[PDB]
Amino acid sequence: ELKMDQALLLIHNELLWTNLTVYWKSECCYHCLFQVLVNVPQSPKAGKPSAAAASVSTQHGSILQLNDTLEEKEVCRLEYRFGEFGNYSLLVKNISEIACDLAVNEDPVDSNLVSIAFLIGLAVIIVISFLRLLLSLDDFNNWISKAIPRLRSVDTFRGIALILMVFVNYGGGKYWYFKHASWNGLTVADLVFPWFVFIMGSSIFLSMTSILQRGCSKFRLLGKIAWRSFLLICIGIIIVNPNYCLGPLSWDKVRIPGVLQRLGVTYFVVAVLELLFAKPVPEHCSERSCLSLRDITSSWPQWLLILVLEGLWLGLTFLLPVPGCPTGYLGPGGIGDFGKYPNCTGGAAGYIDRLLLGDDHLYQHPSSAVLYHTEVAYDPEGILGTINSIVMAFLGVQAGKILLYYKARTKDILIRFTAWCCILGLISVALTKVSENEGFIPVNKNLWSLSYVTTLSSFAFFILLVLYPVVDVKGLWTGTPFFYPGMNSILVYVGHEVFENYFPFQWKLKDNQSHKEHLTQNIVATALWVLIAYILYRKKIFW
Amino acid sequence: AELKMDQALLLIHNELLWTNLTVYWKSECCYHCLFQVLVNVPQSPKAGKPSAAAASVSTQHGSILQLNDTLEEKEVCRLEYRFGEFGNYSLLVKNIHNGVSEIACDLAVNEDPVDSNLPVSIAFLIGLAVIIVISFLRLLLSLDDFNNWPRLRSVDTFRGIALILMVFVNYGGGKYWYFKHASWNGLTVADLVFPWFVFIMGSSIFLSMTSILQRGCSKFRLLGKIAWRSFLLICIGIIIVNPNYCLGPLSWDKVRIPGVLQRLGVTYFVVAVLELLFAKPVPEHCCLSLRDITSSWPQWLLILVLEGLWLGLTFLLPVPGCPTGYLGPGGIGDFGKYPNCTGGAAGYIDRLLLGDDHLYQHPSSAVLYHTEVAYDPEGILGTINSIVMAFLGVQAGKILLYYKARTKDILIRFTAWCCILGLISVALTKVSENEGFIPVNKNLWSLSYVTTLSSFAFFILLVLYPVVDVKGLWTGTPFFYPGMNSILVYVGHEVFENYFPFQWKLKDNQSHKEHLTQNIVATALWVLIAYILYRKKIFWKI
């Protein structure tokens, strides 16, 4: 009967002649219309109330409304939070004063700390497997004997981001907080691509300045950058269009925008801009010497270009009119905002995509469709969000500039990192207030809002601040399993994108509707990808 | 019409007043197939008004029609027509003047298109090939302004040809029966593509191995590299031969273990280690000396022993429910007396070791012989035969290497080997492809199959060695780019087999022209990708 995160609900009417209809609304909505859930017939006789089952989602919160169809007067309003695999028999009865007694026939099953014990057992098994692999490596070394630097902080951060991306791209255990949130708000899966872009820009600066310090030509670097960007865009367009179930995709239903396309475009833009404005690293300098402030001043034209682009983004989002839609719209449409704007997903950001690339070429299953029941096609990797992607890539480039201008000065690097983190956090707090949904520019992924970029950049700066002393300066724990994907980021990304549908990466499940099975499947698949990255790192075949 | 692709309509009219008419059908290329009920036409109720019923007889190749009266099980008539694609082919049966009731079956045709030609492929031959070449030329001319602002090439060309043919036939090849694996015994264009790749793989093994030994390296480093490459090939093959496009992902107990890449990796390891354990330095040649065999008589004896083992297991090992030594297709084969006997002892070993679940469930005989059991072509004894073929490739490499100075001894040895292998194939097969001792078969990897394809590979090398390497008339301009990226391109099209540039919705889903255009476009796309990879000097080769 029930499946996944769906707790059955029993409704019995003990009223007399007020035929009842119940209504449902998720708690996470900002303004959703009360969509109908199930009807309740009139009681056939006194002392014999009728019944009517239902299936209410138990992910996060639940608001129940019971408004009679004969007279629009709410019998009762309930804001209970249902649990997974519950029974939750609900009774409505009169005391004129209609009461609503809610009972729990069966206790809901606990998940995400049963689930804790399963996770601990899986971790123990993984530790045992790692020990066995180490023993096998030692045996191979003994047999051979018998027969006979990017600072690693950038690498570890990119590896962490890529591994989290792989885990959340396999479903992430199908948890509500391990997949992209419906529109506004931040989840674990909403933090892994911005970190990838940030660290990718930092790697762009590090590699480019290392090459320019070494013997190379600017035009050769430009050619390499153009070729790599074109290859990334081509592979993205190829891999964001499977035909596993539907017939082969036609010449028009092809989806142009994608994750790798956005990565290639932002890489090309920021790399060409940096080649246009690239100077040898100055030796501006003992003690703090905070008066230097050379990283920001030495690259003013790039900052001017970034500010111009972001002003363009703000103007287009809050000023450009949209036909049949209020100007400066940020909501998700559908049943959101009381359904007054059925087709306004993204506002101007989606309007530009629909005007340029057409409706059929965009992501036909937006992340907001599950919650807001929207019908318009919206692509999160759209056209107007490329401005913010470029902005965050340049922020990563600035982080690399800070990390490399002060080659061996831990105090200055930490001070600059914490200053940038505090500034970006203050900007984000000012923009989004403190409520996720409320504010000037609420944090969002589908629009790549400025508050989203600032929040993720501040988080990335804090992660770098806590990682650099641990990994490079002091060498506490040198990210043992993480930089192997840190070296083969793009290869591993393409690998799990194209190998997502095969045997070892996903198999038949005894319990199809269960968090534990999906979690222990995705964890094994991600660990397999870590193992593959490690194997390719042993061969020194970095690409 | 409303018919399927490669299927001819068959309208039957009855003029009999006392017998229910049953029509049987059997394709001409069966060796011994039973007759299965195609359609039943009832007797005409009213005199002068024939009963009407329709059937869709397959028009792939050949057709035999037998009409049996269900009243007394008697013979009525017998046709041996060859139907045409998307035809009409109305058939009527009637008596001759009602004299002696000697009823006859006369066939009439109303429309029949023609296939297996170049109706529009001629226009496509230069319609886009010239444009792509011009576009490439324009980029090179523009790049110069922006910029301003030996090797064998014959083994590589042959490997590229074989790889391109495998790519073409793995995408359907226009759905023709030429470019598809034959039903059990028999040869097609798609049956010639894999053993040539194995042959070239062995030859390249010997070439690279002798080159690295002459450069100077430890034998154990090579052994480790070979073992790791074999393990990598086997692993990726196991990963890629199990797609879960079905509604339910493959279970733990239904994964298909054997595959093409498993075969390739196992033969790679076996023959490479065999060559390593008996790798002698090449003598300094100074015409009529049989040195290529007396320098490797140990591994030659080993290969002969392996062939003897294969023959003994195939022709002697008893099988429960099957005769001791069998080669029949299986279902409705050999007059249907052996329902589940596909492969005999060559498939019984597969079932015993790997289990029935872990094998290929839609073998190439299931389309014509209507078999029901699962038999994986890449079995266990097929591994022995593929090892033999790769060893013959190593022998060809030895011939090409030892006599590196003169181009006369090389051609003499290639033609001698080709003649001997062709003679062995003719003796075994008797040149009938159905009877004989060991008929040429791809599913079983028959010894005659290996000898035939080794002779063909030797002739191809004979024609491509002077023209490409020696005289320099040709250099394999579009084909040797996959020559040095065989493994990468194979894995690529096996994983990218279903995506937008390689698979797009068709205007009509059942027409050879559209399928041929799509498959040729995809193969050209893979040629272009291999070219781009070659331009960047990125080489990963087994």
Ligand SMILES: *[C@@H]1O[C@H](CO)[C@@H](O[C@@H]2O[C@H](CO)[C@@H](O)[C@H](O)[C@H]2NC(C)=O)[C@H](O)[C@H]1NC(C)=O
């Ligand atoms: C169709 O009719 C033919 C001819 O009557 C059948 O062929 C005979 O089958 C019997 C077995 O029942 C054999 O003993 C004869 O040797 C066959 N040939 C003759 C009589 O000439 C045939 O079996 C019938 N059924 C099918 C499916 O073909």
Ligand SMILES: *[C@@H]1O[C@H](CO)[C@@H](O)[C@H](O)[C@H]1NC(C)=O
């Ligand atoms: C159910 O509500 C409808 C109102 O449209 C009406 O038939 C009646 O009030 C209820 N039914 C019964 C049987 O009382």
Ligand SMILES: *[C@@H]1O[C@H](CO)[C@@H](O)[C@H](O)[C@H]1NC(C)=O
């Ligand atoms: C019943 O409840 C609301 C109160 O919020 C009332 O205004 C309306 O008539 C009913 N709601 C719906 C969705 O029918």
Ligand SMILES: *[C@@H]1O[C@H](CO)[C@@H](O)[C@H](O)[C@H]1NC(C)=O
């Ligand atoms: C829920 O509780 C009701 C109360 O009687 C019971 O009839 C029903 O079987 C229960 N369902 C489940 C799934 O436990």
Ligand SMILES: *[C@@H]1O[C@H](CO)[C@@H](O)[C@H](O)[C@H]1NC(C)=O
């Ligand atoms: C919204 O779009 C859907 C299809 O995307 C269409 O059916 C519907 O009529 C549109 N409604 C408005 C108000 O534009």
Ligand SMILES: *[C@@H]1O[C@H](CO)[C@@H](O)[C@H](O)[C@H]1NC(C)=O
């Ligand atoms: C034979 O044909 C007659 C008339 O055509 C029909 O009544 C009878 O059922 C048929 N019998 C069989 C076995 O088909």
Ligand SMILES: *[C@@H]1O[C@H](CO)[C@@H](O)[C@H](O)[C@H]1NC(C)=O
């Ligand atoms: C075959 O011809 C008949 C007339 O002889 C016609 O009625 C029928 O439609 C034709 N079949 C097809 C598939 O067109």
Ligand SMILES: *[C@@H]1O[C@H](CO)[C@@H](O)[C@H](O)[C@H]1NC(C)=O
């Ligand atoms: C052949 O195998 C099938 C597998 O489904 C089985 O049903 C059939 O009985 C087998 N044939 C014989 C003669 O046992």
